[PDB]
Amino acid sequence: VAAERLEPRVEEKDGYWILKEQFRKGINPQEKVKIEKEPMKLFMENGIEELAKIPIEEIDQSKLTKDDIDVRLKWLGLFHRRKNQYGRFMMRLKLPNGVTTSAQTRYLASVIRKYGKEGCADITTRQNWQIRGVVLPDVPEILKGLAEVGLTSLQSGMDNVRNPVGNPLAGIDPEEIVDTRPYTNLLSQFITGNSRGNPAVSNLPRKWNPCVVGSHDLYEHPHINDLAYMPATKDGRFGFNLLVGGFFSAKRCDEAIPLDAWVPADDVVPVCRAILEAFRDLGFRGNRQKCRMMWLIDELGVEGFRAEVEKRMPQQQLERASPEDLVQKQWERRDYLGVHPQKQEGYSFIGLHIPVGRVQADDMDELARLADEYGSGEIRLTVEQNIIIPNIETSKIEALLKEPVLSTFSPDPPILMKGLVACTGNQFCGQAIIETKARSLKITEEVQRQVSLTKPVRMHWTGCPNTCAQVQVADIGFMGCLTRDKNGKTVEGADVFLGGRIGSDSHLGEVYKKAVPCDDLVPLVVDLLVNNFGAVPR
Ligand code: SRM
Numbered sequence: 388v389a390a391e392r393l394e395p396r397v398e399e400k401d402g403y404w405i406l407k408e409q410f411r412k413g414i415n416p417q418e419k420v421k422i423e424k425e426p427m428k429l430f431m432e433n434g435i436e437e438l439a440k441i442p443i444e445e446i447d448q449s450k451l452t453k454d455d456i457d458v459r460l461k462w463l464g465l466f467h468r469r470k471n472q473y474g475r476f477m478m479r480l481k482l483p484n485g486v487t488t489s490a491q492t493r494y495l496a497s498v499i500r501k502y503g504k505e506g507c508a509d510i511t512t513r514q515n516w517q518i519r520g521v522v523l524p525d526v527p528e529i530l531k532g533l534a535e536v537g538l539t540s541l542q543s544g545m546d547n548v549r550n551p552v553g554n555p556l557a558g559i560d561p562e563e564i565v566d567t568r569p570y571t572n573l574l575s576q577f578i579t580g581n582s583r584g585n586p587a588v589s590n591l592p593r594k595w596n597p598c599v600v601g602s603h604d605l606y607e608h609p610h611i612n613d614l615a616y617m618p619a620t621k622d623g624r625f626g627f628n629l630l631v632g633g634f635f636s637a638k639r640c641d642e643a644i645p646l647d648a649w650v651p652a653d654d655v656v657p658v659c660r661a662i663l664e665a666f667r668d669l670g671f672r673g674n675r676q677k678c679r680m681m682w683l684i685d686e687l688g689v690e691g692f693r694a695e696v697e698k699r700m701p702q703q704q705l706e707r708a709s710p711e712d713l714v715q716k717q718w719e720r721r722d723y724l725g726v727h728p729q730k731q732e733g734y735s736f737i738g739l740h741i742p743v744g745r746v747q748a749d750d751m752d753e754l755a756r757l758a759d760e761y762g763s764g765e766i767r768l769t770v771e772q773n774i775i776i777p778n779i780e781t782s783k784i785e786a787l788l789k790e791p792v793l794s795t796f797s798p799d800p801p802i803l804m805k806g807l808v809a810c811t812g813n814q815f816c817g818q819a820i821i822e823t824k825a826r827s828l829k830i831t832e833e834v835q836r837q838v839s840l841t842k843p844v845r846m847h848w849t850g851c852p853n854t855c856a857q858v859q860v861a862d863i864g865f866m867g868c869l870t871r872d873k874n875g876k877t878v879e880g881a882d883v884f885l886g887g888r889i890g891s892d893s894h895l896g897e898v899y900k901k902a903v904p905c906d907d908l909v910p911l912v913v914d915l916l917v918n919n920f921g922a923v924p925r
Pocket residue numbers: 466477479509510511512513514515516517543544549550594596611633634635636637676679809810811815816817818853854855856857
C-alpha cells in the first residue's frame with residue numbers, strides 16, 4: 388500500500404465533512420447526493436421546517452427535493468416507503484442498549500395511532516423501535532415530541548453509525564460480565580452529538596454497526612458488528628478487546644476479526660472515534676457493495692488499518708489485545724423469556740414474546756401500563772424482537788401472570804416462537820421479494836402443531852438478500868425469493884439456510900436448499916427439525 392493511499396479523502400468545511408475535490412472521481416450516486424447537499428442540514432439548520440411544507444407531488448418534481456425525502460431524510464431517521472406505502476415514512480430511533488421508558492412508549496403509540504391503518508410499530512434486529520405511517524408535514528412536530536420525551540432519531544439510516552447494541556440483561560443479570568448501558572449510552576451520545584447531530588461521523592462511506600458485550604451468552608452478536616467491544620482484563624485493568632469489520636450483505640458475509648487492540652474502559656469513545664475517522668477518511672466510495680469497513684481492512688491489511696486507528700488515538704497509543712477476554716467459552720445461551728430473578732434481591736424481570744416484533748398503538752399502551760404497574764416504567768427491547776420488563780417486585784409476579792395481555796405477549800410461548808425473527812418484508816419494504824412477518828408466523832404455527840421439541844431452534848426470515856433478519860445466524864434461515872410451482876406459475880419462496888451458530892462458538896450458515904415454494908416449507912421444516920434437532924412428531 389502506497390503512502391498516497393493514506394491521504395484523508397474528506398475535509399471539514401463549515402461544520403460538515405465533505406469529500407475533497409480531488410477524491411470525487413468514480414463515486415457512487417449516494418456520494419453525489421451527499422455532495423449536492425449536506426443531509427445533516429435538514430436537522431442542524433432546520434431545513435426540515437421548509438421542506439415539510441412542500442406538497443409531496445411537488446417535491447417529486449425536482450431531483451434536489453426528491454433526494455431530500457428519499458435519501459437525506461434517513462440522516463433524521465426517516466425512510467420514505469416510496470414503492471409500498473407512498474407518501475408515508477418509517478421512522479427509526481437511536482435506542483442504545485434497547486432501553487425505553489413507558490412515557491416514551493406512550494408517545495410513540497400516540498404518533499402511530501394518528502395514522503390508523505397506515506400506522507404500527509416494530510422492534511428491530513438491533514433492539515430498536517421503528518414507527519410507521521408518518522406524513523412529511525407532521526415531521527417537525529414529531530421531532531419536537533421525540534426530543535421532549537428524551538428520544539432521538541438521528542443518524543439511524545444510510546451512511547451512519549447504527550443503533551449501539553448491548554446486553555438486554557445489563558444491570559439485572561446475576562451472571563453479567565459488565566453493565567453495557569453506560570458504554571452504549573456514551574456511544575450514542577458521541578454518535579449523535581448529544582442529540583444535536585455529529586457531522587464528524589455522519590459522512591461515512593457506508594453504514595456501520597457497533598455493539599458492546601456484557602454477557603457470556605453474547606446476546607450482542609459481536610461476530611457480526613463493524614466494531615465489537617469484548618470485555619477483557621489486561622495487565623490488571625478492566626477494558627475491551629476490539630473486533631472489527633463484521634458485516635452482512637447480498638454479496639458477502641464476514642465475521643468480525645481481531646484488531647489486535649485492547650483499550651481501557653474509559654477509552655471506549657476515543658477508539659470508536661479513531662476507527663470511524665479512519666473509515667471516513669480512507670474508505671472506498673465506489674461500488675456500494677464494496678464500501679463496508681471490512682473492504683478497507685482487506686485493502687490495507689488488518690495491521691495497516693490498525694496503524695490508521697493508532698495515529699488517531701489520543702497520544703497515539705493503542706495497546707495490543709489481551710491474550711484472553713472475560714467471556715467464558717463454557718456457556719449455554721440462556722432463555723430470557725419468562726420470569727427470572729435479578730441480582731437485586733426481591734426483584735425479577737420478565738421476558739415477553741412479541742410475535743414477529745409487530746405491535747399496534749393499543750399494544751404499546753398496554754405494555755407501557757404493565758411496565759408502570761409492575762416494573763419501574765422501563766421496557767427493554769431485544770434483537771430477537773421481544774421485550775423484557777425489568778425491576779418487578781417478585782411478590783407481584785403471580786398477579787402479572789394473570790394479566791390478559793400476556794395471552795398475546797406471552798412469557799412462555801411455544802419454543803419455536805421464542806426463537807423466531809423476521810424482517811419487515813414487503814408489507815412496507817420496497818426491496819422485499821416476499822411477505823415475511825405474517826407468513827413466518829403462519830408457517831411456524833403449522834410446524835409447531837406437527838412436532839414437539841426441546842432444543843431452542845432459532846428460525847430467521849428475511850425478505851431479500853440484504854439479510855436484515857440475519858439468516859446466516861439462524862439454525863434454519865429463510866431468504867425470500869420468487870420461484871415456481873409444479874405448473875410453472877410464479878410463487879413466493881425461500882432459499883433455506885442451515886449451519887448458523889451464535890455465542891462464542893459462532894458460525895455463519897449457508898444456503899442448504901434453493902427456491903422452495905413457501906407453500907411447501909412446512910413439510911421440509913418439520914422433517915429438518917425431526918432429523919437434525921431432535922423434534923418428535925405429535
Ligand atoms: C428494520 C430492520 C429489520 C427488522 O425487521 O428488524 C431493517 C430494515 C431495513 N434495512 Fe436493514 N434492517 C435492520 C437491520 C439490518 C441488519 C442486522 C444487524 O444490524 O445486525 C443487517 C445485516 C447486518 C449488516 O448490516 O452488516 C441489515 C442489512 C441491510 C442492508 C445491506 C447492507 C450492505 O452492506 O449491503 C441494507 C441495504 C443498504 O444499506 O444498502 C438494509 C436496508 C434496510 C432498509 C432501511 C431498506 C429500506 O429503506 O427500505 C429496511 C427498512 C424496511 C422497513 O421499512 O422497516 N439493511 N439491516 C433492522 C433495523 C435495525 C435498526 O434498528 O437499526
